Amino acid sequence: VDYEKESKRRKLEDEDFLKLKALEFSKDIVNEK
Amino acid sequence: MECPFQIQVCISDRFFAFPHNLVEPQSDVGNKLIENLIVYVPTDDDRLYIDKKQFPKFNSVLVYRHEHDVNIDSRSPKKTASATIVYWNPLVPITEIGAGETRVFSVLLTNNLFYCNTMIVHHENPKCPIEFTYPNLRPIACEIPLSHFKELVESNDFLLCFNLETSTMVKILSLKRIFCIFQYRKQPARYVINLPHEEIDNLYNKLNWERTRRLMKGDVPSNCATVNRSSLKYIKQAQSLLGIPDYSQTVVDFVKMFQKIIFPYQLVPNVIIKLNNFDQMVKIRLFCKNDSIAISSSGIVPINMPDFSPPNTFDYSDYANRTNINFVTQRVLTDGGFSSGITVTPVKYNYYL
Amino acid sequence: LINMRRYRNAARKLIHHYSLNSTSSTEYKISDVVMTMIFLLRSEKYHSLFKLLETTFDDYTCRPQMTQVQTDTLLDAVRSLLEMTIDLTTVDIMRSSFARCFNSPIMRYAKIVLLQNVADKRTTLEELLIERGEKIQMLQPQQYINSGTEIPFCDDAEFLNRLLKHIDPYPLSRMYYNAANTMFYTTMENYA
Amino acid sequence: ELINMRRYRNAARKLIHHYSLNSTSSTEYKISDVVMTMIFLLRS
Amino acid sequence: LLTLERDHFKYLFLTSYFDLKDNEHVPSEPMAFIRNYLNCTFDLLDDAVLMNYFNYLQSMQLKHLVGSTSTNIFKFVKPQFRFVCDRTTVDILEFDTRMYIKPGTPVYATNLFTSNPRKMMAFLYAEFGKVFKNKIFVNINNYGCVLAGSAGFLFDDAYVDWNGVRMCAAPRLDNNMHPFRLYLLGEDMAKHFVDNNILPPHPNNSMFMLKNFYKGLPLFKSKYTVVNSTKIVTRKPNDIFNEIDKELNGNCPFIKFIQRDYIFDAQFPPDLLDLLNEYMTKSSIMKIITKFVIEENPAMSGEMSREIILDRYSVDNYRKLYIKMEITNQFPVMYDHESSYIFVSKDFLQLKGTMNAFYAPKQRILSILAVNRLFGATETIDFHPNLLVYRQSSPPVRLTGDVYVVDKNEKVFLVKHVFSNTVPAYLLIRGDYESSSDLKSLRDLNPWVQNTLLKLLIPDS
Amino acid sequence: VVNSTKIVTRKPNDIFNEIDKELNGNCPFIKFIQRDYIFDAQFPPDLLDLLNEYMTKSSIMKIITKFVIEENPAMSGEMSREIILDRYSVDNYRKLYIKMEITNQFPVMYDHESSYIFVSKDFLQLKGTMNAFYAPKQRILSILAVNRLFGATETIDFHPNLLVYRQSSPPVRLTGDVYVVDKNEKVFLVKHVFSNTVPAYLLIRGDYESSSDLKSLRDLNPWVQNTLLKLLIPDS
Amino acid sequence: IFHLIYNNENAVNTICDNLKYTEGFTSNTQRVIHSVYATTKSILDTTNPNTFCSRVSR
Known part of the structure; x- marks a missing residue:
């Protein structure tokens, strides 16, 4: 019984994947330069 | 078209944003990992969205705009054994490869990568956007979606614009990335592509x-x-004839309206027939679970049988003849007091009557 | 073997001219007549018309007798050949024209003729006037307009200019010729 | 059979002979007769 | 070992091919032989008889039948039916989103059936890995594994098209007991199984079983009280229509015209046809056909406890049956609200490309049945604007009931109308008309009439 | 070996037709092999059959594709199979369909062996050039950047008339890489990639102007440079 | 026209309603007003999309 854990985990990730991308393209605290 | 096995391609809508985590140093023949990383991008602006700090595994990271090297046969x-090579959304043939396996991440799958041996396809649950062709929209520089990322993930009415000299492949990649972003949107977003209709049709075909x-x-x-532009025009005409406000009715729902007819009357809706014809210019068949027969544009067909029954299945000679046809047509003309615009055709029959 | 396509083309042109279905006027010759008859003979589709015309070789001052099925077949064949509509009146017109041609002797100058022997009693224009006028007066106006009204002239000068441009390459000479000959041939058919 | 091969032979012989001797119309042969002759030649 | 006669090959096919439960009528010899055949006690059976039966199937020309002279066909999981998947996908429809298949990919229906694809997946994917190996990325779910949409295996029901798409609800529900058949994609998989005599480890059984050449249609015995019967042969639809018209005119309020949904599967022997005549498939086609004009007086009433059935049991042979009207009589399952069919009379002609639209010349009327199909039309007439002759009237002709505007500029309207015999429909009219009540939007109309109207109105540029 | 067949002929057009059919059907690219010893002896057929099981690392191979590459995947074939055409003898060839497998051994080609492109009827290969062709209906002279031509049963001699001078009241603008061949004759070489991503250069003559700075021909590779020398310097 | 060019929807609506309740609006004034409004809106719809694309243009 080899469930499609891959598909389930993929959907779970996709749920918050957009938020994670938003974090990536968020603002930065300081400008080191 | 041939591809070198040394390249491994991963396709995922997520790749609209670069997958920093998935990058990993490649090993040489000596099994020595290469601490130098070279990232290839389709446009110079893309470089700004590559964070070198997100590559702890490597010691040096460089980013360049992949460009067709006419002097190298793909x-x-x-x-280049000195560096690990990664291509992000490549649009032109890869003329250079790194140590070990050259990695590729793309939201697009062009012919160049199509024949690539190693193909990893990430699957996602579909989530469709809304085509909103209409002359309060939010303009979006498609060439740089990640800049508008916040708006793309928040608002729901976007005017997709392009620089005059933007290339066709750049346009295609931008549209694909935007559609991936919408695929991850919880709420479908309406959009309008500020491009000529023929150009939009070609982009959709590609x-x-x-x-x-x-x-x-x-x-x-x-x-x-x-949906191709001709199909959209036909749908708009149908909605207007039925008195349906275009802004009120979506094409998908308009089509779904006739699913109530599809099975119960065992007939193919004319809207679906016309859409299929448009796509063909750019036959239908279906059934239901446990159904013994298939509904088709040709009518009822036994499941798995050809779309047409054997020619000699039915004899139409009795009425499918000039004498009968002319008799019926003349009778119609006389009864209706007509002189033109009348045409009678014998009715042929598929597998079943 | 024969160039059935060329034969068919010549047959079609000759039939058009002899049925007055084309204002187009061109030279014709015994070569063309032979083209036509050979095509008709070779074509299974047109055997009935071949038989009709072949019968013209005799006295030809006779009305062929056909069943309704035969007449329908002949009309269907003719209509398929000329791709139009048509009438057994046109069938008789072709019969008479081809009979006159077949009975005619070899000559150097094409015999200009008028329509004759189509559709027995000779009627004068005056008698036709009396009878047709009586029947018309018997008839009642299908529709009518009220007094006054106003001719609906167009107004869009741009539209007029567009139409003018669209019609500029049309030679008035050719259009006049075509229209006049159309009217003349229709009058000829009515008289005959 | 549409063609009366005998009559067609007769007409064809008439015209061909006529032309086998002279080089003119001799105006009692009528276009028909030509047609008759040519059809005969085709059929035979 | 048990044996079986060619005369009982009809029983063998009846039992093994369809999903039949009315097995009480099988004589003793075929009963025992088929029982062992189905329970796969092949060791108790004559393999020569199996070969004879396979040759019999080939002789009758069963469609998709593919096989060799190996008893492993019956003794092991083996591709028994072959056919090419070719789907003209219509992406705008929310089909049953199953694993994609490349058009032109060969597909094989094997005799294997399982009550749980996920469990079989282990062994089947082991075989798939044997066939391909390497590190080929594949689309794998709990119901199978697909390679490049061109090879692999999957589990589905016993009956799929593979050329059309899946849509709408199921008129039949046999999944309650029906295990999933195994399907193999690719000549590679087919040949591998054929050569290797693949067979999953035993725990037939509860987990899975083999149903050799088992189409699995919901067959059942008619159990009809036949008042009378007769048979006819023809390939001329006008003949069937004439029979229907005669029956309706005489006294029949409505006829049950049935067509068997398998008559195109093989050149069935006449003996097999006779055997099948006792049975019917729940999924076969039926039409409740009545007459457009219904006589008002009861002088035309016939028997109130009898029905007329016209069964197209073969490609060219039909049987007319008079049976006692009885609830216990079983019939093919139609749609819950299956629309009735109305016979076409000479007074009008069905409009081409429409199942419910017709035109009466003498009346100059275009009519669209509200919920009813047309039937029997041997002729059709192309739609044309001239049909909608503009009605002239100095004062606008008043109209009542439901009225809808089709073209205000062209004074085209749709008027609700019920034929005195209570047949709902709409009349498409063009002319100087006015409505007593408020005009109504066409969206109020049902999808059936709306589709017909779209076909009739939008020019096919 | 998924499948195999054999043919006999001395007509190159036959081999080219076979290659064209295979490419058109579903083949992205064919491995055309020629054994490098078929001219050593009248090998007995039995010996030929024995040798067929073997191959020489030094034999000739050509990776032949089709110039026009269909954009849509409707033309895609099997993704785990290859087509090989082996000229195992002087006049006998064997077409083979085999499973795409790494373990399969092949003759050693150059590390960056240029691919071959089949010649279509739309153009003709210029005589004395392995990578130059001319499209009449387009009036275009093209030179493949790194790719060889293949299958050309016909060739056309170069001639100045081919470079028909383009007339244009304003100079036609050009983009990308541009090189000056003859300023006096308004002859230029323009970098161009066929939409199917085939790099090459177009030799043009006419009233043209460059959006960017014109570039020296020395920047070009030796391959294109040799072809250009052959095409331009008259063979006095 | 000015209340359209300048994005003054309140003024546009006020004018529209006043014209609805002023003079023989139904006869021809309504059609004239709709024609003028449609022309202005067509020009604005031609311009504004290109203007926004120019704004976001790189």
Whole structure:
């Protein structure tokens, strides 16, 4: 019984994947330069 | 078209944003990992969205705009064992490869990567956007979607614009990335592409072929399709004739309206027939679970049988003859007091009457 | 073997001229007549018309007798050949024209003729006037307009200019010729 | 059979002979007769 | 070992091909032989008889029948039916999003059936890995594994098209007991199984079983009280229509015209046809056909406890049956609200490309049945604007009931109308008309009439 | 070996037709092999059959594709199979369909062996050039950047008339890489990639102007440079 | 026209309603007003999309 854990985990990730991308393209605290 | 096995391609809508985590140093023949990383991007602006700090595994990271090197045959690209090579959304043939396996991440699947041996396809649950062709929209520089990322993930009415000299492949990649972002949107977003109709049709055709390639590589079917301009015009005419406000009715729902007829009357809706004809210019068949027969544009057909029954299945000679046809036509003309515009045709029959 | 396509083309042109279905006027010759008859003979589709015309070789001052099925077949064949509509009146017109041609002797100058022997009693224009006028007066106006009204002239000068441009390459000479000959041939058919 | 091969032979012989001797119309042969002759030649 | 006669090959096919439960009528010899055949106790059976039966199937020309002279066909999981998947996908429809298949990919229906694809997946994917190996990325779910939409295996029901798409609800529900058949994609998989005599480890059984050449149609015995019967042969639809018209005119309020949904599967022997005549498939086609004009007086009433059935049991042979009206009589399952069919009379002609639209010349009327199909039309007439002759009237002709505007500029309207015999429909009219009540939007109309109207109105540029 | 067949002929057009059919059907690219010893002896057929099981690392191979590459995947074939055409003898060839497998051994080609492109009827290969062709209906002279031509049963001698001078009241603008061949004759070489991503250069003559700075021909590779020398310097 | 060019929807609506309740609006004034409004809106719809694309243009 080899469930499609891959598909389930993929959907779970996709749920918050957009938020994670938003974090990536968020603002930065300081400008080191 | 041939590809070198040394390249491994991963296709995922997520790749609209670069997958920093997935990058990993490659090993040489001596099994020595290479601490130098070279990232290739389709446009210079893309460089700004590559964070070198997100590559702890490597000691040096460089980013360049991949450009067709006319001096190298893609059938046998030059190798650079000194660095690990990664291509992000490549639009032109890869003429260079790194140590070990050259990694590729793409939201698009062009012919160049189509024949690539190692093909990893990430599957996603479909989530379709809304085509909103209409002259309060939010303009979006498609060439740089990640800049508008916040708006793309928040608002729901976007005016997709392009620089005058933007290339066709750049346009295609931008549209694919935006559609991936919408695929991850919880709420479908309306959009308008500020481009000529023919250009939009060509872009849609190319996107459809890309999706076909992904399917052939094992991608999961997605209902999030697109409609050619002629089909949209026909749908608009139908809605107007029925008195349906275009802004009120969506094409998808308009089509779904006739699913109530599809099975119970065992007939193919004329709207679906016309859409299929438009796609063909750019036959139908279906059934239901446990159904013994298939509804088709030709009518009822036994499941798995050809779309047409054997020619001699039915004899139409009795009425499918000039004498009968002329008799019926003349009778119609006389009874209706007509002189033109009348045409009678014998009715042929498929497998079943 | 024969160039059935060329034969068919010549047959079609000759039939058009002899049925007055084309204002187009061109030279014709015994070569063309032979083209036509050979095509008709070779074509299974047109055997009935071949038989009709072949019968013209005799006295030809006779009315062929056909069943309704035969007449329908002949009309269907003719209509398929000329791709139009048509009438057994046109069938008789072709019969008479071809009979006159077949009975005519070899000559150097094409015999200009008028329509004759189509559709027995000779009627004068005056008698036709009386009878047709009586029947018309018997008839009642299908529709009518009220007094006054106003001719609906167009107004869009741009539209007029567009139409003018669209019609500029049309030679008035050719259009006049075509229209006049159309009217003349229709009058000829009515008289005959 | 549409063609009366005998009559067609007769007409064809008439015209061909006529032309086998002279080089003119001799105006009692009528276009028909030509047609008759040519059809005969085709059939035979 | 048990044996079986060619005369009982009809029973063998009846039992093994369809999903039949009315097995009480099988004689003793075929009963025992088929029992062992189905329970796969092949060791108790004559293999020569199996070969004879396979040759019999080939002789009758069963469609998709593919096989060799190996008893492993019956003794092991083996491709028994072949056919090419070719789907003209319509992406705008929310089909049953199953694993994609490349058009032109060969597909094989094997005799294997399982009550749980996920469990079989282990063994089947082991075989798939044997066939391909390497590190080929594949689309794998709990119901199978697909390679590049061109090879692999999957589990589905016993009956799929593979050329059309899946849509709408199921008129039949046999999944309650029906295990999934195994389907193999690719000549590679087919040949591998054929040569290797693949067979999953035993725990037939509860987990899975083999149903050799088992189409699995919902067959059942008619159990009809036949008042009378007769048979006819023809390939001329006008003949069937004439029979229907005669029956309706005489006294029949409505006829049950049935067509068997398998008559195109093989050149069935006449003996087999006779055997099948006792049975019917729940999924076969039926039409409740009545007459457009219904006589008002009861002088035309016939028997109130009898029905007329016209069964197209073969490609060219039909049987007319008079049976006692009885609830216990079983019939093919139609749609819950299956629309009735109305016979076409000479007074009008069905409009081409429409199942419910017709035109009466003498009346100059275009009519669209509200919920009813047309039937029997041997002729059709192309739609044309001239049909909608503009009605002239100095004062606008008043109209009542439901009225809808089709073209205000062209004074085209749709008027609700019920034929005195209570047949709902709409009349498409063009002319100087006015409505007593408020005009109504066409969206109020049902999808059936709306589709017909779209076909009739939008020019096919 | 998924499948195999054999043919006999001395007509190159036959081999080219076979290659064209295979490419058109579904083949992205064919491995055309020629054994490098078929001219050593009248090998007995039995010996030929024995040798067929073997191959020489030094034999000739060509990776032949089709110039026009269909955009849509409707033309895609099997993704785990290859087509090989082996000229195992002087006049006998064997077409083979085999499973795409790494373990399969092949003759050693150049590390960056240039691919071959089949010649279509739309153009003709210029005589004395392995990578130059001319499209009449388009009036275009093209030179493949790194790719060889293949299958050309016909060739056309170069001639100045081919470079028909383009007339244009304003100079036609050009983009990308541009090189000056003859300023006096308004002859230029323009970098161009066929939409199917085939790099090459177009030799044009006419009233043209460059958006960017014109570039020296020395920047070009030796391959294109040799072809250009052959095409331009008259063979006095 | 000015209340359209300048994005003054309140003034546009006020004018529209006043014209609805002023003079023989139904006869021809309504059609004239709709024609003028449609022309202005067509020009604005031609311009504004290109203007926004120019704004976001790189």
